[PDB]
Amino acid sequence: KFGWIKGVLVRCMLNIWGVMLFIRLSWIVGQAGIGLSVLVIMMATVVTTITGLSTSAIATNGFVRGGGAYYLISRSLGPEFGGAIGLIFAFANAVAVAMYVVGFAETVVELLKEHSILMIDEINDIRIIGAITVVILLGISVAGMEWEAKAQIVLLVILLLAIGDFVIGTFIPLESKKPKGFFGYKSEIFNENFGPDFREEETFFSVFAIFFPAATGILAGANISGDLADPQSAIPKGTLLAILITTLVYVGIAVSVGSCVVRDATGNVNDTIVTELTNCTSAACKLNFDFSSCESSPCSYGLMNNFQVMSMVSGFTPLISAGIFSATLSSALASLVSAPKIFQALCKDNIYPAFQMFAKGPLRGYILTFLIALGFILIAELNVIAPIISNFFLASYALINFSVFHASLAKSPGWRPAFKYYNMWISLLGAILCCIVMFVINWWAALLTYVIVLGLYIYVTYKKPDVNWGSSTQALTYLNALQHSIRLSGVEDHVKNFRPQCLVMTGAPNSRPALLHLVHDFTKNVGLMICGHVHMGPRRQAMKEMSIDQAKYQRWLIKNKMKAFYAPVHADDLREGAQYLMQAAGLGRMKPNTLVLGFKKDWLQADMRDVDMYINLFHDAFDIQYGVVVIRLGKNTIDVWWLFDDGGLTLLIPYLLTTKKKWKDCKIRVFIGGKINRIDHDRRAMATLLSKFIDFSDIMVLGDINTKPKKENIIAFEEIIEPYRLHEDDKEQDIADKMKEDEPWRITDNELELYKTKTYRQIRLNELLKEHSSTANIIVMSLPVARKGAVSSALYMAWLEALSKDLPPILLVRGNHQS
Amino acid sequence: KFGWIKGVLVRCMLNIWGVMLFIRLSWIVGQAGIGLSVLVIMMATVVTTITGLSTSAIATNGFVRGGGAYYLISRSLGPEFGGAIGLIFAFANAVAVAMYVVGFAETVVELLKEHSILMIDEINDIRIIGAITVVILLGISVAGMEWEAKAQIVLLVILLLAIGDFVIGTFIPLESKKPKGFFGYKSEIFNENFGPDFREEETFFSVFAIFFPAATGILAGANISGDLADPQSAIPKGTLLAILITTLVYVGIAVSVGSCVVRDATGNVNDTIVTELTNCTSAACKLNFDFSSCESSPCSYGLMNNFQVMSMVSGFTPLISAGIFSATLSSALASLVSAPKIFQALCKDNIYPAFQMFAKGNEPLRGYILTFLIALGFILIAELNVIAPIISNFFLASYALINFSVFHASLAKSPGWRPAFKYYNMWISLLGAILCCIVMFVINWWAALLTYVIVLGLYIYVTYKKPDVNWGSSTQALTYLNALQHSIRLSGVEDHVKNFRPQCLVMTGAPNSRPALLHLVHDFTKNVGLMICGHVHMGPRRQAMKEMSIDQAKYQRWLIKNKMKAFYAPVHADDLREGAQYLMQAAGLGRMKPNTLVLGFKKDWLQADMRDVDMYINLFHDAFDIQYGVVVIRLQKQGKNTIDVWWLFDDGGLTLLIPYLLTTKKKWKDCKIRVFIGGKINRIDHDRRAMATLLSKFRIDFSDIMVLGDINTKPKKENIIAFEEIIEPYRLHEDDKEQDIADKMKEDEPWRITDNELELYKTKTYRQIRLNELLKEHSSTANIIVMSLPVARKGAVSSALYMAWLEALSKDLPPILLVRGNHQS
Ligand SMILES: [Cl-]
Ligand SMILES: [Cl-]
Ligand SMILES: [K+]
Ligand SMILES: [K+]
Topology: which residues are Cytoplasmic (chain B)? Predict the structure, then answer.
């Protein structure tokens, strides 16, 4: 709504123009020459303008919401890059507050000192002034924000008036100021000052580090507003014009003041000499006064001895002092307002669990910024505070540049910048340049910040995959999931690599959570697991019914650490819903390949037409070549049994179960029955086969299964199966037919006589399980197959019941006959 | 075929004991004290033992077939980490060859200088001898490959005997050597030597950096060999015993030579202090053979000045000379045979395509040449104190990489990555990686910065830029798990906002006959949404699975070749409607489920059997019941002419959303969106301003908007007549025919166009015809025309009539789209 001139340009100029303009720029152009100071300014401008290009490319995506720098970085790029940059930038602003207020306090200290007033000491006076100013600025930061927009332009015009006052006063040389080194545009002085004169321990990159804060603040200005009209258009123009204007002004002032004042001089109005020109080495040869003592012994005034040379050279000192005040305070306030906001946004997004508290809306953010600022203000020296802010802001800018380059390098799903002059290789160059300069200024601090950065990046990317942590950009999650699924579909598995992709169908999802938990146990990071539910009734209400049920069951599953996808369906009967889930559900390679059906607990009482369709589900699944699993219900062991191996799924499942922590204590015992003569050969061959795939200790072989079982179990079988026996032998054929055609689902007696052997052997198998595997936590066998049409459903399920009569947890697993 | 001792212990120990045991360790205990030199040794041992634990953890996994170091790291861990580590380690070994050869040259030139023979200079003589010896080592690397294993134990026993000779000689002081500063185990010497004395500008980490390559060589002993039986058990025990033995010998030798020789001496037996005692302050107060004069000026003998103290204190010097030759040559040969193999294996794996020349066989024709040139270039720097730091740098880089790779793979368990080795703790490995990194920055911060810049560049290039690199390993499990994780993340959070992406199910109904429909459907679902194709299988089930799998394979490879991002979803059913219902109701994994339907226009509905048309109308009705958006497409133009859309009602913004998505694509950018509404003539201005607001809020540009109120006008006679002949074949003729026969015919063919329906909906037909005429007149130039799909309640309308309306609206027109959202915002 603001526009761009009042929304970015003004904000960026007031954030950029800070302490260094009117305090250390003279000192910097004194230490180094005009040439290397201009090179310093150009280096800073190059770093800031490359970062400006990267930011403009960031801000031209369609994600234009919220209104905060961290918001743009997080929503356009990954959450982890967003979090890292947000935290580091928040800290950088928290310390920049201290820098600006310390500069202001130093100015007030000197201003009082030149007068009669004074306090206990310079350093302690700086501490007191900085603390009180920080208190006042924070107090303003939460109340007077309704006036900052009005006062913004006033501050900028006052700052510009101060710059104009300095430049105008430059052109008016006076004899009063001449002792202090202010001569005025003399080619001898320009020649003297053009060369480096690093006097104290400082070097090139020390002055570069002390100056860089003169160019930091491009993001802090406008991007954090994000409430502009057409943010896709305000930011790229505003930032890239603010940078140009500020750099031009900096270079102009540097060259001018370097060409206007001599390196060091004293305030002695005497010392004027015209007597001799013996040496006249100094650039003050016109007079030369007696600055030889100044260069040989300590002297107060000069270019380097005192930093407020701009105050003296100016025509009017109150105006330039007001300029310094405004330049420091505006940027201090901007930083102290932009740090807690990022802290609060980070807390709300809850990227870092330690920072999960927002103080009920953001006392935590203000308290952190205040404590960091006050802690650093206790250092009352500015040439030692400037480098650490330089390091933190180079860290932020390097991270932004590399993040943009990386999001472009990997064709990220939601990275279409739509900007001109944004080549990603330039961004990579900016990143490496920032890192190298960070290291050259101070290698160990750069190392420390970068290990912190890498730790944060890895921690966020990997150690937090669970809930997405309040990410409003669930659209980016959708895009990433779509890309992942597309990539998986593209990858064609010539070898199927059969993984457990279950389709668990039970009816009421919450009736038997035990089956779901057991399925969870062997479906951890190995394959898919889709629930199922067929909903009967009119479609009009059913639409709302599944609309609610999908949500309710999916988050009920999620809260149980369940990787469950709910797949509700509407059908005229259970079999139709089974078919719908069976043939359609599953995208690309995530196609379910196993059907896990919950066993009927009380089929005795329920009408057995339902039994018929529940059993026909087995044939329907088999006809499509689905592995069939049926379930019925650490301290003990496990038992695995089978009569055949078709794909090894029956053997593979317990291996998957044991690998988990809960079942780690449990152990698998092999339980089979083979030829009595070939017990040793079969045992050795199967032990070798298992070893080829899985440790084992014992292999029980029960080759006696062929003979008839005990009388009691057989009897119980007949008193189980009698009610639906055809009675074809007992009744008359034609008389029986009147029941057969209208009741064709009766237990086929002819099958009973034909399948006596199957009944006997399966009953004996159940018995042997009873004696042997009673103590096992869970038992596993191969699910018997009854051919369609040849065998009635009722007989098959009677066989199943006899197989699973009064036993601990029991599973029946048959593979799909595919390797 | 080797076992613990001869397979790992011998190789690791004879690789570890290299050049600095007998050349620089005396000088190291000189520069530092006993305490600080022992601290240096312990720090190097800590770094190397943490790396040994991590290497053991890598080597204890099941991947045991190939038998190679780089093979091992690459197969157990990611291909990107494998490639980075392989390249860095190959370079490190190539430089280590130069180091060991330089040590050999220095020792031999010193020996010759002991005699009359002397080339131009020590430095130049080292240069020449390094050249000849490295070429000889290159020759014997390939020529003498068969019998090296026999000389293995010969060299090891010679080295052991050399150490024994040194330690025995330590216990027999001789008068003739005492001038050279060699006493025997004197307490004052020990007390003097416990404190640091850094003569040159070198500091603690300078001597540490020089010393470190005395502790490196653990990997190349056994991991590179590979072909040793039971490696999973041999490698850990063998390497972690070699480290212990060698470190114990290093501490013993350091403390023994630091407590037995004075820092600086002179080979003159004159001016003993026992005659005249001034202060006796020096630690050599016992004799003080005029060593006080050696403080002012350096001396040719002593513990600091002489780099062959181990050859002086020892008993029989030639044995120690032979020991030095043996250790240096053995380590040099091990490095020179390990490097080319890594280069060749890496190039064969094709991780970095630029290195193509080296892939040539069977032996690498160019890899040996590359390592020979690197070694020959580096040995030209005669000084060894200036070669050691860079080998230290590269080996520290490799060890940090191994430790961090193992830690990361432990943090990201997605691959198999089962260690099975106790003492695997990933926190210890991380600590080792950090220690290596910071210690390597403490030495040549800029060299280490360059090394990490290059390492990160290699890693990023291999992992993200490369579409896929699985030539050796084909786990393909990370993709599955990441896709599953993203799917659950998407399906987990409940968002009240609809988030109405366009999710389209397209049922072409043909095997591959209709590609451009797929292309157009993909244009507006390329990154915004999801696209699922359709295919229904007619026939018996028993042959269905194989045929449909083959069809899926061919169409998927075609889509990959067609650069299509879509999913093939086959289904088996009796008829098309059944398959369509199967796909609509039970397709979609979580939130990635279709919410709109795309159907191909029936070109030959007139000629085709009416049963198909009735089924197709039933398919529309089924889609409507489920509340999905319906898009009917019929027709290749990309940028020739503008795009026109003529919607009369808004249903969730789909009518306006689809054209925007189409325009956003690069190949449609050359066209312009133009709306064409037919509304009240009196309220043209209101309609225009409202639609301008609508487009602005939905972010669409409009060339010009015109409102027409002529829809209500009766259509011209010729169009009505033409529609009459179009509908005549299916006319019911209920009024014209008798009631009884008409009802019988209706019972036989209930889909016949009811005359009552035509009479009732005559207004609908007339408005449709007028709309068709207006579209033909106005939007003829535009390549593609989009408008609302006509719809009526089922039963009250005939399938023939509905299809006739659709045909009329899409008669002799450019690309035509009829869109109707699911009535949801
Ligand atoms: Cl500033
Ligand atoms: Cl060595
Ligand atoms: K600033
Ligand atoms: K070594």
Answer: 54-84, 147-149, 222-236, 341-364, 405-427, 459-825
Give the gap in angstroms from C-alpha B509 to the nearest C-alpha of chain A: 16
Inter-chain residue contact B583 with A584, CB threshold 8 Å? yes
SS3 A630: strand
Alpha-helical segments (H) within A78-147: 79-114, 122-143
**Going by C-beta distance under 8 Å and a sequence separation of 6 or more, which residues neighbour residue B367?**
B339, B340, B343, B344, B347, B358
- CA distances to A54, A160, A280, B286, B743 from B185, rounded to whole Å, are 68, 80, 69, 12, 127
| Cα–Cα distance for residue pair B676/A405, rounded to 1 Å | 43
Q: Write the single-letter amino acid at A623.
A: D
Structural determination approach? cryo-EM
Instruction: Return the closest-CA partner of residue A584 out of B126, B322, B570.
Output: B570
d(CA A422, CA A6): 25
For residues B292 and B280, what is the distance between their CA atoms, to the nearest angstrom? 10
A-B CB pairs within 8 A amount to 160
Element (H, E) at A594: strand A594-598
Q: What is the Å distance from ligand 4's center to B242 Cα?
A: 12
Q: Shortest CB distance from B495 goes to which of A474, A539, A543?
A: A474
Distance CA B635, CA B814 (A): 6
Q: Do B582 and A580 touch (CB under 8 A)?
A: yes
Sequence ranges of the binding site of B: 14-20, 89, 100, 213-214, 216-218, 327, 330-331, 395, 399
CA-based angle A255:A256:A257, to the nearest 5? 100
DSSP-assigned beta bridge partners for residue B646: B787
Which of A435, A485, A658 should one mutate to test binding to chain B, selecting the residue with the greatest count of B CBs within 10 A?
A485
Burial class of A549 by CB neighbour count within 10 A (0 to 12, 13 to 18, 19+): middle
Q: Quote the ligand 1 centre to A328 CA distance (angstroms).
A: 8
CA quadruple A2, A6, A12, A15: dihedral sign: negative
Q: How many C-beta atoms surround the C-beta of residue B326 within 10 A?
A: 21
Could you give the count of Cα atoms lying within 13 Å of B277 in the half-sphere of its Cβ? 7
For the four alpha carbons of B634, B638, B643 and B649, in that order, the dihedral sign comes to: positive
Q: Please count the other Cβ atoms lying within 10 Å of the Cβ belonging to residue B773.
A: 16
Pairing of strands B596-600, B673-677: unpaired
| Residues of chain B positioned with their CB less than 8 A from the CB of A477 | 486, 489-490
Dmax over CA atoms of chain B, in Å, equals 154
Contact A31, A198 (CB under 8 A): yes
Closest CA–CA distance from residue B486 to any residue of chain A (Å): 5
Dihedrals phi, psi of B629, to nearest 5 degrees: -65, 145
Contact criterion met (CB < 8 Å) for A587 and B572: no
- Distance from the CA of B819 to the center of ligand 2, in angstroms? 77
- Compute chain A's Rg from CA coordinates: 41
Going from the Cα of A195 to the center of ligand 1, the distance in angstroms, rounded, reads 25
Provide DSSP, B473-500: -----HHHHHHHHHHHHHHHS--SS---
Sign, CA dihedral A262-A265-A271-A276, equals: negative
In the numeric block, the tokens 């960031």 are attached to A58
Q: For an interface test with B, which of A435, A563, A583 has the most B Cβ atoms less than 10 Å from its Cβ?
A: A583
Q: How far is A380 from chain B (nearest CA, A)?
A: 30
Beta strand pairing call for A594-598 and A779-781: unpaired
Q: Chain A residue with minimal CA distance to B553?
A: A492
Are A587 and B569 inside 8 Å of each other by CB?
yes
Query: Ligand 1 centre from A215 Cα, in Å?
Result: 6
- What is the spatial distance between Cα B125 and Cα B109, in angstroms, rounded to a whole number? 7
Kindly state the tokens that stand for A91.
């800290």
